Design a protein around this ligand. Structure first.
Ligand SMILES: [Ca+2]
Ligand code: NA
Length: 220
């Protein structure tokens, strides 16, 4: 997260870190047994770390649970990063408490201009903001018109742009798979973008409200 602010510790209780001996992607807990992330973050086996704030300091609030199954959306495409979403089933249910909680899945898409929050342990491009501590950023959903202006022929109906066209604030590498929550509902998954925080290069996110049908069916 570039140009954001350190999240209040555990305020994004749904935020999890996908680990394989190190942090490589973010994710969102949606139930005691399931985590939603980006399909391009796929790995057959993943160690899901919940209740984290500083990923390199044992805080006593963490839960480390290995995946039992990792499932990419059936229509995911590694060519255009279409339908970039996947589910991770935990080998054992996570315990919900003050530091670990699931975020609601959407049943209603959000309108353009809606203010949301994106978070992650990704690059900050700064020494002032330590990416090892969960970073937060308030950002508005951008119109498809602006998205298509910025990324000609790359934006599908399962994607949406969010951020600042003037640049300076944006999600970044390492934030991938992470959450974009709007009014307490998970509306996006950090997917891709051209560089980070660059003018006219807003972040592109998987549109969960269009992909939630698949998520719900797979969880049941
Ligand atoms: Ca920690
Ligand atoms: Na798969």
């Amino acid at each position: 997260i570039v140009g954001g602010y350190e999240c209040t510790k555990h305020s994004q209780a749904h935020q999890v870190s996908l680990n394989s001996g190190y942090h490589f992607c973010g994710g969102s807990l949606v139930s005691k047994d399931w985590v939603v992330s980006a399909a391009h973050c796929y790995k057959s086996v993943l160690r899901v770390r919940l209740g984290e704030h500083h990923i390199r300091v044992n805080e006593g609030t963490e839960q480390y649970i290995s995946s039992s199954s990792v499932i990419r959306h059936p229509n995911y495409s590694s060519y255009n990063i279409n339908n970039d979403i996947m589910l991770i089933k935990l080998t054992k249910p996570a315990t919900l408490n003050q530091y670990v909680h699931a975020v609601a899945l959407p049943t209603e898409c959000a309108a353009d201009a809606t203010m949301c929050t994106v978070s992650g342990w990704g690059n900050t491009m700064s020494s002032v903001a330590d990416g090892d501590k969960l970073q937060c950023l308030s950002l508005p959903i951008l119109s498809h018109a602006d998205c298509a202006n910025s990324y000609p022929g790359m934006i599908t109906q399962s994607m949406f742009c969010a951020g600042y066209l003037e640049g300076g604030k944006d999600s970044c590498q390492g934030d991938s798979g992470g959450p974009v929550v709007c009014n307490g509902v998970l509306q996006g998954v950090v997917s891709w973008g051209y560089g980070c925080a660059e003018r006219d290069h807003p972040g592109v996110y998987a549109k969960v409200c269009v992909l939630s049908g698949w998520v719900r069916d797979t969880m049941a």
